[PDB]
C-alpha cells in the first residue's frame, strides 16, 4: 500500500509548493493518477488476500472501500473549487491539505492489519473533519455540529479502546489474521455482554444506529460540500467496516446480543424514511436518507450470513456513490440561491434540462431501480433478513414504499411544476458541475456491469 | 530585581529540586522542598499588587503546612526504625500522611483548591514555573517509594483529580485557571499509574511539561489571560494558530498526537493490573477536557472573533518573539506519536 | 453599530467570460483546468482503469474453480463416486469423545 500512500503524501508538498494559479489543476490531476494506481489492488487472481507487510493488507472488503476513497479525493476538490474562489491563497491550500489528509488516513484505516492501528487512524479523521465543518461551514450552527460530531464519536470510542486493550492483554496481539485463526468461543457471562457492547457501540454510533444518529443530520446540514461528500460516502462506512472486522471475535454472543440493534435498525429505518417526507430542508432530506440506508447495513451485519454481508458491502459502495451525488446536486442549487429550503426553488427542469437528468438518475439509484447495485444490496439484505425471520418483510416492504415517495417527491418538488421565475440568478450549469455528476454516475453504471468487484468477503 | 538577586533566587529555585532528587536522606529531601517554597515566593509576588500578594500568601500557608506534615512522617519513621529513609516495614499510616501532604503540595484534588487561584494571581511565566518545574520535586519523592504506597489512596486521589480538573476547567474563561485545572487533571494520570509503573508517570510528566511550556509561551506572546484576549490572535499573531490548535488537541489526548500516548499507555498498564473500573472512568472523564479545549480552539483558530481598531497599530510593529524553543517544543509535543516505542521504554 | 463590511453582491460568473467553465476566474487557467479533469478523469482513469479491470484474469478463482469443478464432476461420475460427500473431513481422522 506504500505505493498508494507515499504518492498521496506527496500531494501535500505539491499543494504548498505549487503556484497560486496551478494549485487546483496540479493537485486534481495527480489525485486522479493516484486513484488509478489503487486499481492494482483489484489484481486478485486467487483466494488469498493481499498481505503487503506487517502493517497493511488488502481484502475484498477493504479494496472497494480503499478505491472509493482514492477516487473521491479528486471529486471533492472539484466540488470545493467554486465556493472557495474568494479565499486567499493560503486558505485554499489549507483546505486542500485537510482534504488530502483525510484521504491518506482513510486509506491507512482500511488497509490496517491490526485493530489498535485501525482505532488510532479511525480517531485521527476527526481532526481534519472537525476543521472542515467548523472553519468552512456557513451557518452559526456549525459550532454545535462540530461538538455533536466530535463527542458522539469520542464517547463511543473510549469503551472500544478499553475493549481492544482487554483483547490484547488476553490474546497477546491485535492482528486481524491471528485473531481470526485463533478465535475462541466466548462465554455468555455478564462481563462478555459488556465486552460486546464495548466493541460495538463505537461502530454503531458512526453508522449511525437509530437513536444515536442526531449527529449526522447536524453535521451534514452545516458542512461544506466536500464535508458532506466524505461524511456520507466513507466516514459512515468506517462503522460498517469495523463491525465486520471485529465481529469475528465476538461469537456466539451476536446470536442474542444483536436483537436490540436489529430492532432499532428495522424500526429505526422506517422512522427515518418517513421523516424525509416532511423534511423542509433539501440537504436534511438526504442526510436522513443516509440514516435509513445504513439501517439495513447494520441489520444485515448483525445476522452474519453470506448473503447479508454481500448485500451490505454492495450497499456500502452503492450508497457511497449515490449519497455523494445527491449532496453535490443539492449543492449546485445552493451555490445559486444560497437557500437549502426544498420548496423555495421549483420547476428547475425548465432551465437546467441536463442537470435535471442527473437528478433523475441519482433519484432512481436512491430508490434502488434494478439492475443498479443499489437494488442488489437492498435485495440481498432482504433475502437474508427474510431467512433470519419472515416478518421482517413487513417492515422492509413499508420502507421500500416510503423510499419511493421521498425520492420522487424530491424530484417532483424541485425539478417540476412551474419555474420560480423570480430567480434571475439561475446561471447555466458549469462544465465543472456537470463533470462532477458524470464522475459519480459513470462508475456506478460500470460497477453494475461487473458486480463481482463489490461482493465482499463471503462472496 | 538586580542581577545579584536573580542569580541567587533563580539558582535556589533550581537548587531545591536537584537536592530533593539527588538525596538519599529524607531530611535532605525535605530541605529541597523548603528551598523551592522559599525562593519561589519573591518571584510570585514581584509585581506587588493586591492579587499577587494574596497569591503568594495562599501559596505560603498551604505549602508550609504540607511541609510540616511531610516532616512529621520523616520523624515518626525515624522513631520507628532509627533510619532516615522509608522502608518496607515503615508504618502504614506514616506512608499515607506523606501521600496526602505531597498531593497537597502537587495540587491534587481534593487538596487542589489553592492551585487555580494561585496560578490566577501571578504572571504567566511564574505560572509556567509553578505548573511545571515545581512539580518534579514532590513527584521525585513519590517515585522513590512507589512499592510502599497504598493504591486505594492513590486511585481515589487520581479519580478525584481527573473529575475535578475536568469540571473545574469547563467553567473557566481565565486562561490561567484553564491551565491550573489542566494541571490538576494530568496529575491525576501521573498519580493513578504511580504505584504500578513509575516510568509511565515520568512519561506523562515529560509530555505534559513540553505541552504546557509552549502553551504558556503562546499566551506570553501577547499577554493574553482571557478567552476573549486569546480570540484576537488571528489579527495579532495568526502564524500561531496552527500550533496552538494542535497543542490544545494534544493536551486533550486526541490521536494521533503525542498527548494520546500518555493516556493510552497508562490505561493499557492499568488494565494489565486489572484496574478496569478506575481506568474506564478516567478515560471517560478525560473526554470533558477535550470539550473545553475544543471550545478554546473554536474561539481562536476555527472562527474569527470581532477585533478592535487599535489592533491595527499592533500590526505595524515588529515582534521579536517567540524564541527557537517554542517551535521545537511545539513540534515534539504533537508530531512524535510515531516514536512512541522509543518513549515508553 | 459596529464597523463591518456590507455583504458582497450577486455576481454573474458569465458576465465577463461567456465561456467560463466553472474552475477559475482567469480564462486561460480556467480552460486548462477543465481539460485536465476530462483527460485524467475520463480519458485515463475511466478508460484504462475500466480496461485494466476487465482483463484481471481468474478473478478470485471464479474461473479456476469452475474449471476444477468440471474436472471433479467428471472424475467422480465415471469412477462411480458420489458427486459430493456428506462429510467434509474423513471420519477416520476424527477421534470423537467417548
Amino acid at each position: 500500500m506504500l505505493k498508494i500512500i507515499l504518492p498521496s503524501l506527496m500531494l501535500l508538498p505539491l499543494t504548498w509548493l505549487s503556484s497560486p494559479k496551478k494549485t487546483w489543476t496540479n493537485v486534481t490531476s495527480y489525485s486522479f493518477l493516484i486513484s488509478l494506481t489503487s486499481l492494482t489492488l483489484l489484481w486478485q487472481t486467487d483466494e488469498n488476500y493481499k498481505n503487503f507487510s506487517n502493517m497493511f493488507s488488502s481484502d475484498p472488503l477493504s479494496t472497494p472501500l480503499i478505491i472509493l476513497t482514492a477516487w473521491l479525493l479528486p471529486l471533492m476538490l472539484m466540488a470545493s473549487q467554486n465556493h472557495l474562489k474568494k479565499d486567499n491563497n493560503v486558505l485554499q491550500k489549507l483546505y486542500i491539505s485537510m482534504l488530502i489528509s483525510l484521504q491518506i488516513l482513510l486509506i491507512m484505516t482500511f488497509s490496517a492489519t491490526e485493530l489498535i492501528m485501525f482505532y488510532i487512524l479511525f480517531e485521527a479523521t476527526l481532526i481534519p473533519t472537525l476543521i472542515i465543518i467548523t472553519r468552512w461551514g456557513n451557518q452559526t450552527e456549525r459550532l454545535n455540529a462540530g461538538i455533536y460530531f466530535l463527542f458522539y464519536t469520542l464517547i463511543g470510542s473510549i469503551p472500544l479502546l478499553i475493549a481492544l486493550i482487554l483483547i490484547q492483554n488476553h490474546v497477546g496481539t491485535l492482528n486481524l489474521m491471528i485473531l481470526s485463526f485463533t478465535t475462541h468461543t466466548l462465554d455468555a457471562s455478564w462481563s462478555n455482554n459488556l465486552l460486546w457492547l464495548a466493541c460495538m457501540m463505537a461502530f454503531l454510533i458512526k453508522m449511525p444506529l437509530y437513536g444515536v444518529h442526531l449527529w449526522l443530520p447536524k453535521a451534514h446540514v452545516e458542512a461544506p460540500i466536500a464535508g458532506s461528500m466524505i461524511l456520507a460516502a466513507i466516514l459512515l462506512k468506517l462503522g460498517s467496516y469495523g463491525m465486520i472486522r471485529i465481529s469475528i471475535i465476538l461469537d456466539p454472543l451476536t446470536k442474542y446480543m444483536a436483537y436490540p440493534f436489529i430492532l432499532l435498525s428495522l424500526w429505526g429505518m422506517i422512522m427515518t424514511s418517513s421523516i424525509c417526507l416532511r423534511q423542509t430542508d433539501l440537504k436534511s432530506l438526504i442526510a436522513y436518507s443516509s440514516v435509513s440506508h445504513m439501517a439495513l447495513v447494520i441489520a444485515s451485519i448483525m445476522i452474519q450470513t453470506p448473503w447479508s454481508f454481500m448485500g451490505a458491502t454492495m450497499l456500502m459502495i452503492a450508497h457511497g456513490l449515490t449519497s455523494s451525488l445527491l449532496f453535490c446536486l443539492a449543492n449546485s442549487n445552493y451555490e445559486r440561491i444560497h437557500s437549502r429550503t426544498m420548496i423555495m426553488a421549483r420547476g428547475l427542469q425548465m432551465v437546467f434540462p441536463l442537470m435535471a437528468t442527473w437528478w433523475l438518475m441519482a433519484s432512481l439509484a436512491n430508490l434502488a431501480l434494478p439492475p443498479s447495485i443499489n437494488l442488489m444490496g437492498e435485495l440481498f439484505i432482504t433475502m437474508s433478513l427474510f431467512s433470519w425471520s419472515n416478518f421482517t418483510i413487513i417492515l422492509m416492504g413499508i420502507n421500500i414504499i416510503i423510499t419511493g415517495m421521498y425520492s420522487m417527491y424530491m424530484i417532483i418538488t424541485t425539478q417540476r411544476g412551474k419555474l420560480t421565475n423570480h430567480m434571475i440568478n439561475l446561471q447555466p450549469s458549469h462544465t465543472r458541475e456537470l463533470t462532477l455528476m458524470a464522475l459519480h454516475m459513470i462508475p456506478l453504471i460500470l460497477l453494475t456491469t461487473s458486480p463481482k468487484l463489490i461482493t465482499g468477503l463471503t462472496m | 530585581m538586580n542581577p545579584i538577586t536573580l542569580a541567587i533566587i533563580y539558582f535556589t529555585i533550581f537548587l531545591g529540586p536537584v537536592i530533593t532528587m539527588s538525596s538519599t536522606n529524607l531530611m535532605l529531601m525535605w530541605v529541597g522542598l523548603e528551598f523551592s517554597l522559599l525562593a519561589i515566593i519573591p518571584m510570585l509576588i514581584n509585581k506587588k499588587n493586591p492579587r499577587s500578594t494574596e497569591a503568594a500568601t495562599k501559596y505560603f500557608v498551604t505549602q508550609a503546612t504540607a511541609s510540616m506534615i511531610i516532616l512529621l512522617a520523616i520523624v515518626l519513621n525515624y522513631k520507628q526504625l532509627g533510619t532516615w529513609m522509608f522502608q518496607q516495614q515503615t508504618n502504614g499510616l506514616i506512608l499515607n500522611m506523606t501521600l496526602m501532604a505531597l498531593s497537597m503540595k502537587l495540587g491534587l484534588a481534593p487538596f487542589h483548591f489553592w492551585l487555580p487561584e494561585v496560578t490566577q494571581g501571578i504572571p504567566l511565566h511564574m505560572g509556567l514555573i509553578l505548573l511545571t518545574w515545581q512539580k518534579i520535586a514532590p513527584l521525585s519523592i513519590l517515585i522513590q517509594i512507589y512499592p510502599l504506597l497504598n493504591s486505594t489512596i492513590i486511585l481515589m486521589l487520581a479519580i478525584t483529580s481527573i473529575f475535578m480538573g475536568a469540571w473545574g476547567g469547563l467553567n473557566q474563561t481565565q486562561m490561567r485557571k484553564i491551565m491550573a485545572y489542566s494541571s490538576i487533571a494530568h496529575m491525576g494520570w501521573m498519580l493513578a499509574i504511580l504505584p504500578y509503573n513509575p516510568s509511565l508517570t515520568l512519561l506523562n510528566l515529560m509530555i505534559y511539561i513540553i505541552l504546557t511550556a509552549p502553551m504558556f509561551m503562546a499566551l506570553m506572546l501577547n499577554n493574553s489571560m482571557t478567552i476573549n484576549s486569546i480570540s484576537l490572535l488571528w489579527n495579532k499573531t495568526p502564524a500561531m494558530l496552527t500550533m496552538i490548535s494542535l497543542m490544545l488537541l494534544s493536551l486533550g489526548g486526541l490521536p494521533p498526537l503525542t498527548g494520546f500516548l500518555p493516556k493510552w499507555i497508562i490505561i493499557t498498564e492499568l488494565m494489565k493490573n486489572n484496574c478496569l473500573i478506575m481506568a474506564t472512568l478516567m478515560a471517560m472523564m478525560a473526554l470533558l477536557n477535550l470539550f473545553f479545549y475544543t471550545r478554546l480552539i473554536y474561539s481562536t483558530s476555527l472562527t474569527m472573533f470581532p477585533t478592535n481598531n487599535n489592533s491595527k497599530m499592533m500590526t505595524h510593529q515588529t515582534k521579536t518573539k517567540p524564541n527557537l524553543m517554542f517551535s521545537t517544543l511545539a513540534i515534539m509535543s504533537t508530531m512524535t506519536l510515531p516514536l512512541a516505542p522509543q518513549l515508553i521504554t | 453599530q459596529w464597523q463591518e463590511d456590507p455583504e458582497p453582491e450577486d455576481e454573474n460568473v458569465y458576465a465577463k467570460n461567456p465561456d467560463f467553465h466553472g474552475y477559475d476566474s482567469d480564462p486561460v487557467v480556467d480552460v486548462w483546468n477543465m481539460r485536465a479533469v476530462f483527460f485524467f478523469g475520463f480519458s485515463i482513469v475511466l478508460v484504462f482503469g475500466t480496461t485494466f479491470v476487465a482483463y484481471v484474469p481468474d478473478y478470485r478463482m471464479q474461473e479456476w474453480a469452475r474449471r476444477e469443478a468440471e474436472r471433479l464432476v467428471k472424475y467422480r461420475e465415471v469412477n462411480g463416486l458420489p458427486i459430493m460427500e456428506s462429510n467434509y473431513f474423513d471420519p477416520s481422522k476424527i477421534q470423537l469423545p467417548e
Binding site: 468552512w136 | 474563561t173 480570540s231 470581532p306 | 459596529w2
Partner: peptide, 19 residues
C-alpha cells in the same frame, strides 16, 4: 449569503467571570 462569523453578542458570552 456569507459565512457567519461571531458578532458582539456571541463574544460577550465569554466575557464573564465564569462560563
Amino acid at each position: 449569503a456569507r459565512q457567519w462569523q461571531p458578532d458582539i453578542e456571541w463574544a460577550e458570552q465569554f466575557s464573564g467571570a465564569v462560563m
